[PDB]
Amino acid sequence: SALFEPYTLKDVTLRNRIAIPPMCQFMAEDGLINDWHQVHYASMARGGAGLLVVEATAVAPEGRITPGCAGIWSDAHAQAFVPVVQAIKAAGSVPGIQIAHAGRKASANRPWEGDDHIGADDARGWETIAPSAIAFGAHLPNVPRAMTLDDIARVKQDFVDAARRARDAGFEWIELHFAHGYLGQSFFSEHSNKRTDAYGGSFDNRSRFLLETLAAVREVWPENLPLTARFGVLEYDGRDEQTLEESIELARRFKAGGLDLLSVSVGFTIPETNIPWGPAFMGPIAERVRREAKLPVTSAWGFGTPQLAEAALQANQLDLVSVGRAHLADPHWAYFAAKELGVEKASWTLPAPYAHWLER
Amino acid sequence: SALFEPYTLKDVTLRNRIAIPPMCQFMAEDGLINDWHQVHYASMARGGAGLLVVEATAVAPEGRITPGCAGIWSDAHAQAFVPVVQAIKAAGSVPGIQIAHAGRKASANRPWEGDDHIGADDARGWETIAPSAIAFGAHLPNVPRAMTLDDIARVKQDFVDAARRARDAGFEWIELHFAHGYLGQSFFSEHSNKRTDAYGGSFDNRSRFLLETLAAVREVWPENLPLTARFGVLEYDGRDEQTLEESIELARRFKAGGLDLLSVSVGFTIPETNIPWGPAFMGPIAERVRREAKLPVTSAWGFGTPQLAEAALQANQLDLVSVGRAHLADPHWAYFAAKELGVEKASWTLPAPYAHWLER
């Protein structure tokens, strides 16, 4: 089975092609993770996935999505991740982390607590920042503060500091969150970037914040550990052909800047879209990015059955299959997939105290 | 769905009828549990089961089955369970513990490390004790030492001390391990008990160790928390009708002695048996014990599908359905069962950071 072939990138070898993508838990307090995360991540890692990318972790307090988001903006925040890193490793999985800045989507309620921008009378809210003073709209009406050149320098340094902290905590895989309408995505998109300086307008200018952040992180992230990013390559906004061509060109420049793998996603930059949700719908798009930018890729959003994941790998559409929600349903999903795909000794996808008994 | 109706026993209310029965992990060192158990138990409790009975925990070092078995023979051992108790309660499940003494089946290798008695030349092993100096046979050939009267007094006090510690550590449910051919079961069975003193021979004498241990534990275990036991009520040894009749009579004496619920199992006292393994095969036996001894019961050994579990409850064969191996496969099995049985808001069997997304 292709899903259960190992994968080597730089000095890191994953035991299979199942990746757990970053999934916010909204359970942190003042950015500090706790026993929710410790058990959540350790259990999924024991489930058998080869790579576990920890949830969007804010590089600065105002870069959290919600008051429940994890942060890594101080050394104390980074030290809190050390037992998560070590528990993922102890399970035989590879610990990764997505470092993030929510941009204009920040200062929002948890999804089961309204999912909307926090009210200005609520003591939990904060001022958001973005390329331009333009609101997402819909359930996120708060207008962000337009960043100055000094803000751009500071946020870039925050990504650098976060990458250095993640390195020292023992993460072996880093993902820059340039997707999903948060800060990085919003610099790239003409929907949200109306700037008239070096960081808006042309393709080079809109790419500049993302390329400069990648280059600054590259200075401190080890050359022998995978340096990756998540990027929304189209919006389903009626501009898909031109947007995908530009996004693929940016992927070429990411590769020239030392990126090892691209997590291919959807932009979610504005609400006025028509995303064609369906099983493995990102397959053909990820395949095109992979082939045209000549870069390894993963994707998500509907690959969460064993046969769909296997098919995407056999078709060379993906190098790793990211399986998110199925691992919330079943933290041992990788074992379930090994059983369904007829892997020999499938129960030994799990550690011995489970594997021995599920073999019979 | 009967499976998702709450259950109240003494002052304890379980949110559904799904119980996770004790399942040895063989991962402790010198009796002390560790990060294996912490994540293992916390993840299963978050999965939605109403009651989680922690694995067979030895009341004395020689009462471990293996060198990997958990123990509670000192206050330091008991304090190590506190974070497990806390994590089970934090998930909304009820923490229980099975306290145990392996008797003549002690000093054995882990199941994936030979599953047999440790050799006499192997320094990891220890002398075993039992009612009589007679081996189980087969893969457990070691002849135990016949217990002295002082041994009997000491082991009873060890059960008391273990129950006292479990109480003070915050367990809300206790299970005396009188099943599966270990010490207590071997006092009851004529196969293993050849004693000629007050603890062997007659039905009263063979019952004596179990009744005296129950009474001694009853003195330190709170009135308002369920006091339960696991007991093998037949062997499938060709003596089933007579053995079941005597076992039900003992269950009546357990009830008179304050037992609140009986976990009905098979004796496993000797290897020369013909156990008719199959789906829900214990259903009719558990029902007969429940009805004739007028005690609430649980059972296991093949109820691990949602429909089999639901059927056993609707037929009033069980009060709680114990689902073991399916929870090793999927720690969120209770959520899987809620979906299959069409429970409304089935995803909210899980905590919010999962439930919100699995509801869609």
Ligand SMILES: Cc1cc2nc3c(=O)[nH]c(=O)nc-3n(C[C@H](O)[C@H](O)[C@H](O)COP(=O)(O)O)c2cc1C
């Ligand atoms: C609860 C939850 C949290 C998520 N958090 C993140 C995140 O922090 N960063 C990110 O890039 N994507 C995040 N996502 C998107 C997922 O990584 C993934 O793309 C999505 O769940 C689709 O894959 P799936 O169909 O296998 O679930 C999250 C998704 C969910 C359901």
Ligand SMILES: Cc1cc2nc3c(=O)[nH]c(=O)nc-3n(C[C@H](O)[C@H](O)[C@H](O)COP(=O)(O)O)c2cc1C
């Ligand atoms: C790994 C494992 C450990 C077990 N440990 C115990 C134990 O410590 N005490 C006990 O009474 N039964 C123990 N059992 C038996 C189970 O509690 C249960 O009766 C058995 O797994 C059958 O239920 P199931 O079909 O739902 O798995 C264990 C079973 C397994 C597979």
Ligand SMILES: COCCOC(=O)/C(=N\O)C(C)=O
């Ligand atoms: C305390 O155990 C942490 C996780 O340990 C495992 O998952 C494991 N075996 O149990 C291996 C070899 O990976």
Ligand SMILES: COCCOC(=O)/C(=N\O)C(C)=O
């Ligand atoms: C509608 O938004 C979908 C894309 O955004 C995400 O997946 C995400 N973080 O990247 C979270 C926390 O939801």
Ligand SMILES: COCCOC(=O)/C(=N\O)C(C)=O
């Ligand atoms: C399926 O694993 C093979 C044997 O499993 C069992 O029957 C069992 N518990 O379920 C024990 C403790 O022996």
Ligand SMILES: COCCOC(=O)/C(=N\O)C(C)=O
């Ligand atoms: C509200 O979620 C219900 C599940 O319980 C928890 O939250 C939890 N552990 O279970 C911790 C340590 O946060």
Ligand SMILES: COCCOC(=O)/C(=N\O)C(C)=O
């Ligand atoms: C073949 O024996 C089955 C009955 O014994 C058990 O289930 C048990 N403990 O009670 C363990 C640890 O296996």
Ligand SMILES: COCCOC(=O)/C(=N\O)C(C)=O
């Ligand atoms: C989860 O079921 C509802 C659909 O929501 C999503 O697709 C999603 N992630 O999978 C996010 C972050 O919005």
